[PDB]
Amino acid sequence: SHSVKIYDTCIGCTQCVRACPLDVLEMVPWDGCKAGQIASSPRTEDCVGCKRCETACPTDFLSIRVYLGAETTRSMGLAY
Ligand code: SF4
Ligand code: SF4
């Protein structure tokens, strides 16, 4: 698992929207879900790159951006 930006990658696995004691992967405006809302991380104001998510969808999507333990230079967690 790598990166977890705001993507409309959701099917109904529940995963990703569970492993997060900080509550990052929240509900966003989408047009595909039963409630036209995709589980993404819009307000990542709270998240110090913890080890929980590591399950952002099957990766079938997840725009090729990479982030999780990738750069951690300016977006480490606070520096951002
Ligand atoms: S690092 Fe932790 S708080 Fe941040 S997205 Fe992953 S599970 Fe949620
Ligand atoms: S891993 Fe991908 S399908 Fe599953 S709950 Fe998260 S967004 Fe939805």
UniProtKB/Swiss-Prot annotation:
Q: How does it sit in the membrane?
A: Peripheral membrane protein
Does the record bear Magnesium in its keywords?
A: no
Sites where the protein binds [4Fe-4S] cluster 1: C10, C13, C16, C57
| Reactions catalysed | reduced [plastocyanin] + hnu + oxidized [2Fe-2S]-[ferredoxin] = oxidized [plastocyanin] + reduced [2Fe-2S]-[ferredoxin]
Q: Does the keyword Electron transport apply?
A: yes
Question: How is the cofactor bound, in the record's words?
Answer: Binds 2 [4Fe-4S] clusters. Cluster 2 is most probably the spectroscopically characterized electron acceptor FA and cluster 1 is most probably FB.
Q: Where does [4Fe-4S] cluster 2 bind?
A: C20, C47, C50, C53
Against PROSITE patterns, the record matches this protein to:
4FE4S_FER_1, 4FE4S_FER_2
Gene Ontology BP terms: photosynthetic electron transport in photosystem I
Obligatory cofactor(s): [4Fe-4S] cluster
For this protein, the Enzyme Commission number is 1.97.1.12
UniProt keywords, alphabetically = 4Fe-4S, Electron transport, Iron, Iron-sulfur, Membrane, Metal-binding, Oxidoreductase, Photosynthesis, Photosystem I, Repeat, Thylakoid, Transport
CC annotations in GO: photosystem I; plasma membrane-derived thylakoid membrane
What happens when you mutate C13 to A/D/S?
Generates altered FB cluster (in vitro)
Q: Where in the cell is it found?
A: Cellular thylakoid membrane
Specify the domain of life of the species encoding this protein.
Bacteria
Q: Which InterPro entries does the UniProt record give?
A: 4Fe4S_Fe-S-bd, 4Fe4S_Fe_S_CS, PSI_iron-sulfur_center, PSI_PsaC
The Gene Ontology terms for molecular function here are: 4 iron, 4 sulfur cluster binding; electron transfer activity; metal ion binding; molecular adaptor activity; oxidoreductase activity
Name all 4Fe-4S ferredoxin-type domain ranges.
1-30, 36-67
Documented effect of changing C33 to A/S = No measurable effect
- Cited function: Apoprotein for the two 4Fe-4S centers FA and FB of photosystem I (PSI); essential for photochemical activity. FB is the terminal electron acceptor of PSI, donating electrons to ferredoxin. The C-terminus interacts with PsaA/B/D and helps assemble the protein into the PSI complex. Required for binding of PsaD and PsaE to PSI. PSI is a plastocyanin/cytochrome c6-ferredoxin oxidoreductase, converting photonic excitation into a charge separation, which transfers an electron from the donor P700 chlorophyll pair to the spectroscopically characterized acceptors A0, A1, FX, FA and FB in turn.
Assembly state and interactors?
Answer: The cyanobacterial PSI reaction center is composed of one copy each of PsaA,B,C,D,E,F,I,J,K,L,M and X, and forms trimeric complexes.
For this protein, the record's PANTHER family field holds: PHOTOSYSTEM I IRON-SULFUR CENTER, PHOTOSYSTEM I IRON-SULFUR CENTER-RELATED
Protein name as annotated: Photosystem I iron-sulfur center
Gene symbol of the encoding locus: psaC
